Each structure stands twice: as C-alpha cells, then as structure tokens.
Paper text:
PoxtA and OptrA are ATP binding cassette (ABC) proteins of the F subtype (ABCF). They confer resistance to oxazolidinone and phenicol antibiotics, such as linezolid and chloramphenicol, which stall translating ribosomes when certain amino acids are present at a defined position in the nascent polypeptide chain. ARE–ABCFs are comprised of two ABC nucleotide-binding domains (NBD1 and NBD2) that are separated by a helical linker termed an ARD (antibiotic-resistance domain), and, depending on the species, ARE–ABCFs may also have an additional “Arm” subdomain inserted within NBD1 as well as a C-terminal extension (CTE). Cryo-EM structures of PoxtA on the ribosome reveal that it binds in the E-site and, despite the short ARD, still induces a distortion of the P-site tRNA, leading to retraction of its CCA-end from the PTC.
Further subsorting of ribosomal particles using a mask focused on the intersubunit space yielded four defined classes, which we refer to as states I–IV. States I and II contained density for PoxtA bound in the E-site and tRNA in the P site, and had average resolutions of 2.9 and 3.0 Å, respectively. Additional density located between NBD1 and NBD2 of PoxtA was attributed to two ATP molecules (ATP-1 and ATP-2) and a likely magnesium ion, as expected from the use of the ATPase-deficient PoxtA-EQ2 variant. As observed for other ribosome-bound ARE–ABCF structures, the NBDs of PoxtA adopt a closed conformation, which is also consistent with the inability to hydrolyse ATP. In states I and II, which contain PoxtA, but lack A-site tRNA, some density for the fMet moiety on the distorted P-site tRNA is evident but is poorly resolved. Despite the short ARD, binding of PoxtA to the E-site nevertheless causes a distortion of the P-site tRNA when compared to the canonical P-site tRNA binding position, such as that observed in state IV. While the ASL remains fixed in position on the SSU where it decodes the P-site codon of the mRNA, the elbow region shifts towards the E-site by ~6–7 Å, thus bringing it into contact with NBD2 of PoxtA. As a consequence, the single-stranded CCA-3ʹ end of the P-site tRNA becomes contorted in the presence of PoxtA and the canonical interactions of the C75 and C74 of a P-site tRNA with 23S nucleotides G2251 and G2252, respectively, of the P-loop (H80) are disrupted. This results in a shift in register such that C75 basepairs with G2252 and C74 stacks upon Gln282 of PoxtA and interacts with G2253 and C2254.
Residue numbers in the entry:
A (entry chain 6): 1 to 44
B (entry chain W): 1 to 91
C (entry chain G): 2 to 275
RNA sequence: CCCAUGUCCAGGUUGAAGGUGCGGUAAAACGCACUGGAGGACCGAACCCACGUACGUUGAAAAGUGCGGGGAUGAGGUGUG
RNA sequence: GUAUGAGUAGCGAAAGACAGGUGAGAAUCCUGUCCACCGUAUGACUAAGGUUUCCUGGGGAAGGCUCGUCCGCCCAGGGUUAGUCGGGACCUAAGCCGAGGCCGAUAGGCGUAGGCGAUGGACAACAGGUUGAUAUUCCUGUACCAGUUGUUUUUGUUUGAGCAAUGGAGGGACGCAGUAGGCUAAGGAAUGCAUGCGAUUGGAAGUGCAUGUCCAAGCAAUGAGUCUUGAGUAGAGUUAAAUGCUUUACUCUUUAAGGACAAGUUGUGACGGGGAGCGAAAUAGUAGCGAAGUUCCUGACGUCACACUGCCAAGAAAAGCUUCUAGUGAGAAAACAACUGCCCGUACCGUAAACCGACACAGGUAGUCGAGGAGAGUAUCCUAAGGUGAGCGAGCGAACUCUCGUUAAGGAACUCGGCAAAAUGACCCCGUAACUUCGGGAGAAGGGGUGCUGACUUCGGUCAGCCGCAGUGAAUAGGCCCAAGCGACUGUUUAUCAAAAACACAGGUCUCUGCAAAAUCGUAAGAUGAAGUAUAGGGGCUGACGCCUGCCCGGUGCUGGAA
RNA sequence: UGAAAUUUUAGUACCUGUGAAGAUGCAGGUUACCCGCGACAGGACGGAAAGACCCCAUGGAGCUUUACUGUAGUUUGAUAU
C-alpha cells in the first residue's frame, strides 16, 4: 500500500514554490489572494 | 562588515575548553563571515598567528515557553587553531 | 537474404529476419552520427498527436547526404552499413578530398565503386545528375522536388522510379506508387534503385519485436466505448453499424480521399495512383 | 502513457542458427559426431504480480494476513529528473 | 456537556526465568546469569524523507493502549569542524526559461541566440587514533591537487624560448547476450605458528580443548595479460594557417615490429598501527602492556572488461583533456623552502517507534555489504559477526470460534462443484504413448536406487558386511491421465467484488497519403508525423498456422462522370 | 487500562383474539418469588444505509441517431487584396 503523499523537497518547491507562483499571472493571483486573506505562509 | 563585527563572542563549553588545551579557540561569528575573513579578524584582534580555521553552521534550535514556541537564532561557529610559536588568546 | 528461424518457441515460430549479408561493418562513422530522441508521437504541446508510437530501442541519427551536390571529386564506397532510422541501408563513402559522407545504398552497390555527381557523370548506379541529364527509361531514386533541397522521393528500401520523358522545364516521372507526375528538370536524382529489396518480406514474428521497432499496440475502435470512438459501444461484438467506417475523429476510413482538392501540385501530377 | 539518464534480475536446466571433423557425391544435397550458445525458452529465490481459499470485516490494515498461486532476459522490474 | 451499551469489546503476529540493585512505590527501570528469537536479516552501510528525535544531567503532570524509578516524552545544558567526501565556483540530456523575433480580442502562445537543468560525464587522501555526542572533516603518520612569494639552477629575450584560441582537429564516446581466461577479495582445512588451560560425570598430557593467526593511500620497481599493422611517395582537403587532422592512388611491412593500455604483485610507506590476551592504582577491565600472522584447498560477472565472441532491436550530449597552427610574447622551466586554497551538507533515525500510512499501525520504502555446515543456490534447517525477547499481565485449562496435530472401517457416498485438506515433491538410473507446425508432447506415463562400515576401484562404481518401522530418516522442492469448448502462443485489463472466451499480438486485407504528404494538437504561429518519403506513414476491420473465404452494386456510403 | 454502533420513557412473560389486517405493552385467560453469571440467537417487522427493484417529478446526468434547432470544421461561389 503506497500512499498518495510521497514527500520530496525539490518537487514541493518546483511545483508550489514561490518562484513558480511568480512565473505565471495566475500564480501571482494566488499570491495576491493569500496576502489579502492574511496567510502567514503564502507559498511553499 | 567591520573586522571587529566579524567575531561576536567566545564559546565556553566542555568541548571548547578541551580545544583550548590544544590551542584552538571557538568563536561565534557573523553568519555571513567566511573562514578567511574570520582568520583576518582573529589576527587583527589578538595579534596571534592562525594556523587553520574550521567553520560550521549551527542550525536554529526549536524552543518554547508556555503557549509560545519559536526558534533560537541561527549561529555560525568557527574553531580557530593557532600556530605553534604563537601567543595564546586570553579570555 | 531472408533467414527463417526454426519454430523452437511459439514466439519464434514463423519468424523471419534478414541475414545482413550485405552489411560490411557495424561501426558507424563518429563524425556523421547525431543524437535523436524518441518523440513517441508527442508534439511541442506534449499531446499524443500520432497514436501507436513510442518506446523501443535507442537510436542515433546518421547524417545522410540527400543533396549529392559535391560534384568536384569522386566518392569511393567504403562500407555498407545498417541504418536504424530507415528501411534501406546506407553507404559510407570517402571523397578524394577527404570529406566523409553517407548515402543511400542502391541495389547492386558494392564497396570500391567510385561514384560521381554532376551533369557529366556517367549513367551508373549511385551517380547523381540533374534530371535533365538522365536519359528516358532510366531507373532512379532519391529524387528531389526542388533544386538544391535534396532528395525526398524514392528513398525506402527497394523503391525506384523511372524517367518517362521531358517537356518544357519539367521531366516526366513514374514514381514508386505508379503515379506519373512532372518534376522540375533541375532536380537531381541518383541512378539505380534503393537496395535492401528484401525488407518487405520480413515476418516480424512476435509482439515484442514490434515494440522494439517503436510501435505501440493498436486498439480497434470497435472495442472502445462510445465516448472514445464512433465505433465504440454496443452489446457484444458489433458490426460497424454506421454508414461507413470512420477514424476516431469521424473521417471515413475506406475509399474517402483526403488529398487537398485545391492542391497547387495538381498542375504537375499527370496520372494519379493511390 | 511517455521522455532523458541510472540501476536490478541467486542458482540450476535446455541446446536454435552457425562452425569444425568424419562419412557421402563429379560437386552436392544429406548423414553422424563434436563445437556453439539462440530463446517475449524451462525450473526456481530476491523482485514484480494477485488465481483459490480461510480468517479479518466498529480490522493489525479505508483492500490486509496465513496457507497455497503466476511471471521471473523481458511487450521485464525499479530509482532520479 | 453528560449518559446508555459497560467496567463490556479491545489492550495490535513471537519466551522468558530468577538473583541482586535502585527507589515512596518495580512482572514492566538498571546489572548479572541461563534460556529463547532473527541471521540475503530482525545484522552493517548508505540515498530520500524526517528535522533535533543525537549526547549529558534531571522529571514522572500529560503522551506510552498496563506499569513505570523508564522513553523517540517533559525540563536544562551540549553536540554536526573538509583544498581532497556529495553539491556550488566544471559539463551537458530530457525538460524548462527565453534578448530580439513569430503569432494572437485582452491575457498571452511559440520560439532563435543564450542559458538553466543530473538521475549521466569530469574531478586531488588514505591508514590508524581520539569524544558522552563529529570525523576520508579533529589529532598522529605519510600524501596528492591548483596557485603565490622567495633562494638556487639552467635558457630566451623580437633570425624570438615560451604561452596559445571562441578557430582546424583528436578524444571523451557508450547496446544486449554468451561463455572462457587472468588477478584479488571472500571462504575452508591443517598433529602450520603463537598464547592460555588439563578438565573431575566414566575416559583422555594428546592426532586434548579454547582463542588468534595482518595492515592502507601515495611513491618505486614490475606485471597476468588486452588492444592495435607500421612506414614512404604523389595528390586533394581542412572558410585564414598548421608540423595537427581527414582522405585518394601508389610502393614496402604486417606469425612480427613499434605503439597504447592493464587488474594485480614486490618493496617502501612500517623503528608505525592493529592484534589473542595480560592488566594498574589514587577508582576500570580503563591507563598501560602485548605473542604468532605459515602452508594447502576452493575461489568470485568483485576487477582486467563490454576484453573477446555472437546477435539485431543497432545502442547520449557537452566539457574537462591532447594536438595544430593563428595570435601573444620577455621572460620561462626545474629543484628547494615557506606559504595560500572560498560557500553549502556533515548530528541522529533510516526493511523504521524517528520516512509514507490520522497511531510507538502485522502494510509500503531506491542502492551497497550480506559469513559457516549440508547445499546448484542469497532456497531450506540450525548457527557466526551482530542484533533482539516485541509496552498489559497472573490464573484456569468449559462451550463456542479461530490456527494446528492425530484419527478405527469406508474412501467423494460430501458438494453446485473433490471447495478445503490429503496425496506428489530433491537427486541418480531405467523408461516413456496418441498427436505434431517435427520444435515438441516430456519431468508424459510407469518403475528402481538413496543410511552406516569395510575391501577394491578406472574414483563412478562394484563386492562384502551392519542397523532401523523407515536412510533426499528433519526442513525446503510437480499430483497424474483421458476427453470436449474457447482463445493460437509469452503478454494486458476493471487500484478496492469480474484476469476471462475480453484487449493486445505476429500474420491477412481494405483504404488514405507524391511531401508544406495524409493524420493529429493549436484561433494562429509553431509542432508531432519525420530530421521519415509509398518495401513509408495514418485509418478501418480480421487476428498464429493449415484449407478456404460462395451469391447480391437494387438501397445507403465511397469513388468517378458531366450532357 | 478502557471504547463503539444503538437509545421516547420503560417495573420490558405465554396463549388465543383484537387492532393500520403479523402485539412485551390492547382484551380474556394462563404462567411467573428478588438480583445476577456463562451460553444460544426466535422476536423486538433488531442495528447499519431518507430502497439501488417498482412507480412518480412537465428532476439530473452520460450515450445514440435519417428527433428539433444550431455550430467547429470541410468544401463551393461572389467580392477585396
Ligand atoms: K496558515
Ligand atoms: K510467432
Ligand atoms: K534498417
Ligand atoms: K488491433
Ligand atoms: K461492443
Ligand atoms: K490471499
Ligand atoms: K460514551
Ligand atoms: K456505561
Ligand atoms: K530518567
Ligand atoms: K567539496
Ligand atoms: K551525479
Ligand atoms: K602547447
Ligand atoms: K587514491
Ligand atoms: K603499497
Ligand atoms: K558527520
Ligand atoms: K558448502
Ligand atoms: K546461507
Ligand atoms: K512490557
Ligand atoms: K476457565
Ligand atoms: K468448539
Ligand atoms: K457419506
Ligand atoms: K500428457
Ligand atoms: K531399505
Ligand atoms: K518440483
Ligand atoms: K483472450
Ligand atoms: K492471439
Ligand atoms: K481459430
Ligand atoms: K490469468
Ligand atoms: K480487456
Ligand atoms: K486466417
Ligand atoms: K492495418
Ligand atoms: K468489417
Ligand atoms: K493488424
Ligand atoms: K448493393
Ligand atoms: K451502390
Ligand atoms: K401501522
Ligand atoms: K435473537
Ligand atoms: K452520471
Ligand atoms: Mg564545513
Ligand atoms: Mg497506427
Ligand atoms: Mg468494452
Ligand atoms: Mg460519437
Ligand atoms: Mg457501434
Ligand atoms: Mg449480438
Ligand atoms: Mg520465460
Ligand atoms: Mg519494492
Ligand atoms: Mg495490475
Ligand atoms: Mg510459463
Ligand atoms: Mg518461473
Ligand atoms: Mg454484554
Ligand atoms: Mg503488544
Ligand atoms: Mg531466507
Ligand atoms: Mg536518547
Ligand atoms: Mg535521559
Ligand atoms: Mg500510564
Ligand atoms: Mg563533485
Ligand atoms: Mg518559450
Ligand atoms: Mg519578448
Ligand atoms: Mg574526486
Ligand atoms: Mg555517532
Ligand atoms: Mg574422571
Ligand atoms: Mg584556407
Ligand atoms: Mg572473473
Ligand atoms: Mg553520521
Ligand atoms: Mg510498522
Ligand atoms: Mg534460529
Ligand atoms: Mg480415517
Ligand atoms: Mg487406516
Ligand atoms: Mg454425489
Ligand atoms: Mg447428496
Ligand atoms: Mg484444491
Ligand atoms: Mg527429508
Ligand atoms: Mg489467451
Ligand atoms: Mg498468460
Ligand atoms: Mg477488482
Ligand atoms: Mg480478482
Ligand atoms: Mg476479433
Ligand atoms: Mg382483524
Ligand atoms: Mg396478533
Ligand atoms: Mg398497561
Ligand atoms: Mg415495539
Ligand atoms: Mg431494520
Ligand atoms: Mg425514499
């Protein structure tokens, strides 16, 4: 029974990282929304 | 950074005292200081001659008081070995 | 020739392959090798655009000289080599000036032949000449459609075309498909026919061999679901159950022509076939 | 599913093509030995899989375990990106 | 928020016993002894992941399915040392970003140059010791790599040593399978060597018992072997040039010669270190001391080395590196001495109680090492090194349920169905049918042998004898046959009720497609098809192979025609 | 050491009958001292899941086609370039 979550530092950053979010207009929209909501952590 | 700002404080512990017996002294240094800069700063400050400098990064350590939890500040530790025929650092 | 394996195993049963007798070496030319990746039928969007492709053995690209535009000096045929990229074999040839190149190996080519290219080259297997210089009735291959572009037509193993005549600035040609068309007289071609004629007769023998050759399984539309293929669905085996069989995207699959009706090349195609 | 680049498959068994020798013939085909080591080949661990059954079924487990079961140099398993 | 069920289910695979100690309190914590368990692992390393869980000293609120004096918990201190290891200051693959550029209601999409990007290439250090916690990082010893300064020694200074391209080249540079050979680890035996001991339960001072039985990198010398023809002439090229490289003809050489590689061995590294064991106080088995380190047997797909052979499915790139000139050039080279060498990771767990599973969860987790007897073996049983006794127990030994052993006579009468279980099972020998695509069927079937002790063996046997109910005496190992349907076959499939006759398949056939091909993704640009070209590519159907595949073109499609 | 599903309150018998037509609870009669423990599963139309069968809603979704109406594409003409 291999489960869905297989941790990996590099993959987390490459997929959900701050620079990845900033590379795309929609990723920047996510960052804006997180800031507006006030999330302490806006990116992985 | 200023040479005087490079070295922050000595480290006094069982391990560091044993090191002193071998004529190597442990100092907390600015986290951005490379061991070459550390060597220059030690020489200017203490007039001794440095044989080698071994540097290592101490990770921030998790702590908690009551309802609050955080991390101690990260540190940078440098073990400086003086040459023979050199004055000792007096603390 | 074709060697038939003894039926030692059901997989090996009925299998045949080539003996590679013509092949003289197995060490390609380092200078002419190029890297190739297996696109596996996926385009820049990453979507599968051509089904049933992918996997299989790794290959290196051999830079073939389809242009044959080096007319100054003669090229001596050094070796006949297997080419993983094409059905036909290739020939490594050394030009007397020291330039190494690969060409298609015509039927009857042999090590030591001194090929030449240019208008004055004699009509010998492996020579290259502009179509205007090739006498009628000659059998040729590696025909180029535009001058200087390099041979494009008649390159598969065992294929060949025949020169039928001249007219205006064009040359009448019967292609391997039986289609007769005009081709610009300044286009070049190689005298002869592409070697390795036996290629067609190989019996692959087992599924794993197709997988080696980079063919992934083909699934019949009749055994898909309705949302997958127009033939999909129905209880049990079903007939086509439509006006005509169609591709996965509804294009009729039997007899329905697809050539563009306003093709510019109709003016040059004299007699069609296929 | 695919791409690039790595990596894994204890140990046994069988004996294809080809080759050599001797027969045989005008030359052959062909025959007999030896050699040779092919295979989605055979048996079988690791590995992968999941056919039968019992149990489990507020479980040890939101799909498993026990006993057996199939594949195991390939259309193979698997890692990293 | 609190009840009921209820002091009920459950307390999550397995062996512990006792003595002593600690302490308010002990089945559960510590110590000791015996016993037991794993041992191709439940041992030893590592990558990811986790992120302080590591060490030391305290604590017993909560967490731990019981307990707890204890813990991966809580509290306080402490712990990760690199020119050489892995990464960066090196290279590139897939893929990604992308100056200009192309395309596009907006947003943006695509892409050249150029970059990024290891899982690959390149690249200089090892042995021992030391701490409670780090070690190829610290220390001792002995090195190497890049560079700076300086001393000395040679040689060159513009008829110019030397350096040297972003340029020309070479090289890097590569698959799979198959055995064979060399070498070394590894393993085993010895009345080899060294040390220690002589047993009390009847016997043994000997061929008794136990334990050990060797050491780098670097440097030097060599080396099992492995690959490879080597010159010369005349040309032609290599955007300029070249002595380099590529190459065409022509001579001579080719059992060789020359050249390029090479595991490993010997010496030194070593007056060093380890090492059975002996063993100190002032408080341990710890300072410290410390013998021997032979021969023989087996012997690695570990290494030479993808070396050789064979095969088809035809098996990265770039840099480093080596050469060539072009350019650049007044300084160079050697030895020696001293000196310089940055950032990041380094703790600990890691077939797990520390990772993925909500749990201290019978699941999952890449790679390396992985011993002995019997054995083909990493199977199997019992063991070595090493690790562990599983975080509720004490009784009792009812039904019933589960897991397992045995079972008179019968032997499928059970049942939807021989489901389950039983039976067969290893090796050696004899022997083996229909049918067949000649390969198989086939381990068909059906039989026989297996222990121990002598003798002789051509070393595999044979002959003789002995014992038992039984000799692959345990463990681990096919049940078989006749016949029919379906599917040719190996494969694939509904993760988690269906593994099949379903899908695929090789083969067949039809049809499209002349290349800016057809087809497909996309508004487009741009892509795949394909750096392919009708013996190719796409689509439909059928589905090995063998024998065959009849009649109908009126209707519907397609194709052609054009009055 | 210590849950859970369930649970209107319950001092919670049997027969025949009655009743929304299948009663522990209603009628007549019978039986039965109070409280438990170990077992079994006939009943509580037992628990679990606002039945998936069936029907209905001018509900939903996926699919088909010579259903209706559109439409991407493909093609043909005019016209501009
Ligand atoms: K948050
Ligand atoms: K076959
Ligand atoms: K080919
Ligand atoms: K098919
Ligand atoms: K169907
Ligand atoms: K099972
Ligand atoms: K409760
Ligand atoms: K209760
Ligand atoms: K404690
Ligand atoms: K490093
Ligand atoms: K790497
Ligand atoms: K040079
Ligand atoms: K070394
Ligand atoms: K040595
Ligand atoms: K470390
Ligand atoms: K053995
Ligand atoms: K073993
Ligand atoms: K316990
Ligand atoms: K009892
Ligand atoms: K029972
Ligand atoms: K019976
Ligand atoms: K049979
Ligand atoms: K017997
Ligand atoms: K067996
Ligand atoms: K089938
Ligand atoms: K089939
Ligand atoms: K059939
Ligand atoms: K099956
Ligand atoms: K299927
Ligand atoms: K057929
Ligand atoms: K077809
Ligand atoms: K059909
Ligand atoms: K087919
Ligand atoms: K008809
Ligand atoms: K018709
Ligand atoms: K009612
Ligand atoms: K009941
Ligand atoms: K639905
Ligand atoms: Mg460091
Ligand atoms: Mg296809
Ligand atoms: Mg279906
Ligand atoms: Mg449809
Ligand atoms: Mg249908
Ligand atoms: Mg039907
Ligand atoms: Mg097989
Ligand atoms: Mg696994
Ligand atoms: Mg599966
Ligand atoms: Mg099988
Ligand atoms: Mg098998
Ligand atoms: Mg109860
Ligand atoms: Mg337990
Ligand atoms: Mg085992
Ligand atoms: Mg601890
Ligand atoms: Mg503690
Ligand atoms: Mg407790
Ligand atoms: Mg490195
Ligand atoms: Mg882009
Ligand atoms: Mg731009
Ligand atoms: Mg290195
Ligand atoms: Mg440690
Ligand atoms: Mg005695
Ligand atoms: Mg030039
Ligand atoms: Mg070997
Ligand atoms: Mg460590
Ligand atoms: Mg676990
Ligand atoms: Mg055991
Ligand atoms: Mg019986
Ligand atoms: Mg009996
Ligand atoms: Mg019966
Ligand atoms: Mg019966
Ligand atoms: Mg059975
Ligand atoms: Mg046995
Ligand atoms: Mg089948
Ligand atoms: Mg199968
Ligand atoms: Mg299923
Ligand atoms: Mg199943
Ligand atoms: Mg079919
Ligand atoms: Mg009534
Ligand atoms: Mg009633
Ligand atoms: Mg009442
Ligand atoms: Mg009621
Ligand atoms: Mg109910
Ligand atoms: Mg309802």
């Amino acid at each position: 029974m291999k489960r869905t979550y297989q941790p990996n530092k590099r993959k987390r950053q490459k997929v959900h990282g701050f620079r990845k979010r900033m590379s795309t207009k929609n990723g920047r929209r996510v960052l804006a929304s997180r800031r507006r909501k006030g999330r302490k952590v806006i990116s992985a | 950074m200023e040479l005087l700002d490079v070295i922050k404080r000595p480290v006094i512990t069982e391990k560091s005292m044993l090191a002193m017996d071998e004529k190597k002294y442990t100092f907390e240094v600015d986290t951005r200081a490379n061991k070459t800069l550390v060597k220059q700063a030690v020489e200017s400050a203490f007039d001794v001659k440095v044989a080698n400098v071994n540097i290592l990064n101490v990770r921030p350590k998790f702590k908690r008081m009551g309802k609050y939890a955080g991390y101690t500040k990260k540190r940078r530790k440098a073990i400086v070995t003086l040459t023979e025929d050199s004055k000792e650092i007096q603390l | 020739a074709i060697k038939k394996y003894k039926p030692t195993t059901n997989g090996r049963r009925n299998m045949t392959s080539s003996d590679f007798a013509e092949i003289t070496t197995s060490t390609p030319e380092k200078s002419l090798l190029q890297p190739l990746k297996n696109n596996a039928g996926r385009n820049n969007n990453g979507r599968i655009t051509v089904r049933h492709q992918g996997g299989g053995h790794k290959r290196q690209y051999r830079v073939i000289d389809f242009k044959r535009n080096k007319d100054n000096v003669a090229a001596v045929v050094k070796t006949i080599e297997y080419d993983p990229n094409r059905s036909a074999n290739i020939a490594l040839v050394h030009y007397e000036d020291g330039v190494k190149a690969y060409i298609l190996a015509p039927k009857g080519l042999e090590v030591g032949m001194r090929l030449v290219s240019g208008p004055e080259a004699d009509i010998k297997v492996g020579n290259a000449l502009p179509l205007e210089n090739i006498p009628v009735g000659t059998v040729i291959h590696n025909i180029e459609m535009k001058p200087g572009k390099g041979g494009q037509l008649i390159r598969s193993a065992g294929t060949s075309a025949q020169v039928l005549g001249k007219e205006g600035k064009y040359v009448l040609i019967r292609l391997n498909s039986g289609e007769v068309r005009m081709i610009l007289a300044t286009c070049r071609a190689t005298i002869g026919s592409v070697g390795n004629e036996q290629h067609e007769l190989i019996n692959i023998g087992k599924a794993g061999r197709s997988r080696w050759m980079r063919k992934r399984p083909t699934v019949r539309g009749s055994v898909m679901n309705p949302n997958d293929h127009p033939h999909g669905g129905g209880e049990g085996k079903t007939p086509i159950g439509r006006k005509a069989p169609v591709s996965p995207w509804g294009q009729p699959a039997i007899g329905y022509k697809t050539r563009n009706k306003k093709a510019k090349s109709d003016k040059l195609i004299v007699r069609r076939r296929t």
